[PDB]
Amino acid sequence: TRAIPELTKLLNDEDQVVVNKAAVMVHQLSKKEASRHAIMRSPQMVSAIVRTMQNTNDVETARCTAGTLHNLSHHREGLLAIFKSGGIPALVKMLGSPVDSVLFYAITTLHNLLLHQEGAKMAVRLAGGLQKMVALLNKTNVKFLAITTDCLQILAYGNQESKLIILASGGPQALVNIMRTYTYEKLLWTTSRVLKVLSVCSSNKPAIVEAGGMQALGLHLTDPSQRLVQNCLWTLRNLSDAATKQEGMEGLLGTLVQLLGSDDINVVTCAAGILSNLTCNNYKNKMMVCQVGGIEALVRTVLRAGDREDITEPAICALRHLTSRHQEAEMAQNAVRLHYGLPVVVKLLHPPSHWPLIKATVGLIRNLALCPANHAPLREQGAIPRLVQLLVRAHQDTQRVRMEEIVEGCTGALHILARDVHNRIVIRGLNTIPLFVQLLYSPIENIQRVAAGVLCELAQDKEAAEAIEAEGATAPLTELLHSRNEGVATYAAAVLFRMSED
């Protein structure tokens, strides 16, 4: 307490020579916690240590002053002393220091602040800490990297403000690199946490993808660390959502198709969800995923899934995606069948199944139906029946995942299946012409199209054709000829025509 006012003067002395002196003593005196508390409880002393550290030009003076603050850091009260002495901006400024001794005390002190000092993370942002820190992500000391990224995570968590700043500083690229370079699991984990926190940000998300992070993330999906894999999966989850077709996605897709067989049912679900996202409208990802044996893996995930819609929805969507509009699609449809998916798929159409899933399944059935080799098998499973059953009920909840979609779904599915002469025997057996004819009136062009299509396939027989004619099909169809939508107008015609020659 006595040499305190005195030392304080020495640290605020004019020449570095004399300061150096005060610094070394203070630092030293900074170890026996008895003297520690005295130093921490003096606003003058603390404030000088601060000042000197940022202004001194003598490394020994810098490290000692920095180390002293570091030692004060271990005490909740010290943290307070530092906070009220401009300490934070000071420590931030030191994040630019070329010497590691200094760079270390600095970051590590700002960490203990961010972990226990209220008002700290504000102070750190306002001082430009986020940037200096993101720049530091270029250093190679793993434990340094680990402390640093955690600072980022402590600052970014629930603060869009901080996230944006991180992005402007090149955060995405920096973190991705770390995930691609280091093995040290603590670092990998922390970094992946910062990326999860950023992947929810409408702004950051795209950059993370650009930076080839989805690919990077995939290098850890099978890591012994469970805490690591989870953060990667949830991050890939938010990212896979919407994305600009990247490249090299071969490796990741492959690794995802692989996790589909995990022993952990919680891993299989995310791999499933991430594959649905990665394929939703992508003839490129669809191509690769199919060839990595994905169709087989998805179907297999399904059978195993049972009535766990948690797993079945993403899995079915994935298949619906994988069986349409692409080179490999005409083969994926046969695939689903050769691996006994047909049975389990039609099964998912009946309860307990809930809407968002059924919709996807009707979707899958319409595609699998494109392929003739499924027409028979699907009938044999009783798809036509449950399809009309659903249709009729959706339609009645639009007169009495919205119901109008189920209507367009079962009709569009029946329209395809309606391609097999036998499936017409059945469709026409369930006495469904009056409903299809009525659907012509549906305010929705797409419903008309597929309704006109179902009728066109059926009108393929002078028999049904007149059954369609007798149910008042003509007025709605003629008034359906001028529909601005060509597909609708065309079907309308094929029918008007088919029920003629009298």
Distance CA 360, CA 362 (A): 6
Q: Quote the Cα angle for 156-157-159, to 5°.
A: 65
CATH class assigned to 1-502: mainly alpha
* Among candidate residues 169, 185, 176, 82, the one with its CA nearest the CA of residue 133: 169
Residue 190 tokens read as 């922390």
Distance CA 163, CA 161 (A): 6
Q: Which amino acid is at 23?
A: A
Residue 402 tokens read as 């919205």
Q: For the chain, what is the largest distance between any 2 Cα atoms, rounded to a whole number of angstroms?
A: 119
The shares of helix, strand and coil residues in the chain, as percent rounded to the nearest 5, are 75, 0, 25
Q: Quote the Cα angle for 499-389-485, to 5°.
A: 45
In this structure, how many other beta carbons lie within 10 angstroms of the beta carbon of residue 417? Answer: 26
- Residue 268 backbone class (left: φ over 0; alpha: ψ -120 to 50; beta: rest): alpha
Distance CA 171, CA 130 (A): 9
Q: What 3-state DSSP class applies to 371? A: coil
H helices of 397-473, in order, are: 403-417, 421-429, 433-439, 445-458, 462-470
Residue 439 tokens read as 């659907």
Distance CA 370, CA 337 (A): 13
Contact of 65 with 98, CB cutoff 8 Å? no
H helices of 137-225, in order, are: 142-156, 160-168, 171-181, 185-198, 204-210, 213-217
Contact of 185 with 225, CB cutoff 8 Å? yes
In this structure, which long-range contacts are made by residues 122-125, counting pairs with CB atoms below 8 Å and at least 24 apart in sequence?
A: 123/83, 123/88, 123/89, 124/88, 124/92, 124/151, 124/155, 125/155, 125/161, 125/162, 125/165
Distance CA 56, CA 66 (A): 11
Model resolution, angstroms:
2.9
Kindly give, in sequence order, each residue whose CB lies less than 8 Å from that of residue 133, ignoring residues fewer than 6 positions away.
Answer: 95, 107, 148, 151, 152
Q: Which amino acid is at 328?
A: E
Contact of 384 with 374, CB cutoff 8 Å? no
